[PDB]
Design a protein around this ligand. Structure first.
Ligand SMILES: OC[C@H]1O[C@@H](O[C@H]2[C@H](O)[C@H](O)[C@H](O[C@H]3[C@H](O)[C@H](O)[C@H](O[C@H]4[C@H](O)[C@H](O)[C@H](O[C@H]5[C@H](O)[C@H](O)[C@@H](O)O[C@@H]5CO)O[C@@H]4CO)O[C@@H]3CO)O[C@@H]2CO)[C@@H](O)[C@@H](O)[C@@H]1O
Ligand SMILES: [Ca+2]
Length: 144
């Protein structure tokens, strides 16, 4: 069994993760497992992610642990996103939504198309604009 996500538990800090809004830190307060987790700071929409080459016609599971440290207004989303390879490059997003203030695990299943329009991206997107900080850890993307 292989997790496609690089540094999936943030145990190597922010290695392999893009920081899009300069609002990410690998800290112990955000750890669900191991010593570190990802904190996305509250107050503005922010996130990060990584490119993950996926196999065509393949079924995957996407899962993650998350919690906000205070009640949020919006959500924190764990997303696999890519274009289909057709005349339109239709955009598809497989989305997990979190708004819980206790550590919560969520997972989904998806099957990739025969051809990709773009390289799949794993996005950790804290669209919430409340003061709440977001903790995320142990992100899984696994072929089943
Ligand atoms: O900033 C410099 C770097 O930017 C990089 O590009 C980033 C960009 O900055 C931004 O962070 C962007 O963030 C997007 C997320 O990646 C993701 O695609 C997200 O998708 C959202 C939808 O927008 C929408 O909100 C959707 O709502 C759903 C709910 O989730 C739910 O299902 C239900 O309520 O229905 C709703 C729809 O009605 O949720 C999606 C999942 O979160 O949108 C974000 C934009 O707001 O990501 C870019 C990377 O992809 C790079 O360009 C980099 O090079 C720069 O350095
Ligand atoms: Ca961890």
């Amino acid at each position: 069994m292989v997790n496609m996500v690089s540094n999936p538990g943030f145990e190597d800090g922010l290695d392999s993760w893009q920081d899009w809004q300069q609002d990410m830190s690998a800290v112990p307060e955000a750890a669900h497992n191991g010593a570190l987790g990802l904190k996305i700071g509250g107050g503005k929409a922010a996130g990060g992610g990584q490119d993950i080459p996926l196999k065509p016609n393949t079924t995957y599971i996407l899962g993650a642990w998350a919690k906000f440290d205070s009640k949020p207004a919006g959500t924190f989303d764990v997303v696999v996103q890519y274009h289909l390879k057709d005349a339109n490059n239709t955009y598809v997003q497989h989305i997990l939504n979190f708004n819980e203030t206790d550590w919560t695990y969520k997972q989904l299943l998806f099957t990739t198309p025969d051809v990709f329009g773009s390289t799949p991206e794993l996005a950790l997107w804290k669209g919430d604009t409340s003061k709440a900080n977001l903790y995320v850890d142990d992100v899984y993307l696994v072929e089943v």
